[PDB]
């Protein structure tokens, strides 16, 4: 049950937004990573 954001540093699915802050849950680090679509992506291998 879901993903949305990731912690750059302490590696851990966060998920949040606006009035929420921009930090963390179990390191306090201000840097977040967007996290991969589930729409599936195809490559031609050429």
Residues found near other proteins in the complex (CB under 8 A): 11, 36, 40-46
For Zn ion, give the closer residue by CB, 3 or 27.
27
Conformational region of residue 29, where left means phi above 0, alpha means psi within -120 to 50, and beta covers everything else: beta
Q: Rounded to whole angstroms, how far apart are CA atoms 30 and 22? A: 6
Q: Rounded to whole angstroms, how far apart are CA atoms 23 and 29? A: 5
Q: Which partner, other proteins, Zn ion, none, binds residue 43 by CB below 5 to 8 Å per kind?
A: other proteins
Q: Which partner, other proteins, Zn ion, none, binds residue 10 by CB below 5 to 8 Å per kind?
A: Zn ion
Q: Residues forming the annotated binding site for Zn(2+)?
A: 7, 10, 24, 27
């Amino acid at each position: 049950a879901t993903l949305k954001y990731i912690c750059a540093e302490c590696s851990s699915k966060l998920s949040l937004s606006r009035t929420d802050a921009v930090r963390c849950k179990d390191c306090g680090h201000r840097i977040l990573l967007k996290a991969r679509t589930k729409r599936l992506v195809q490559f031609e291998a050429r």
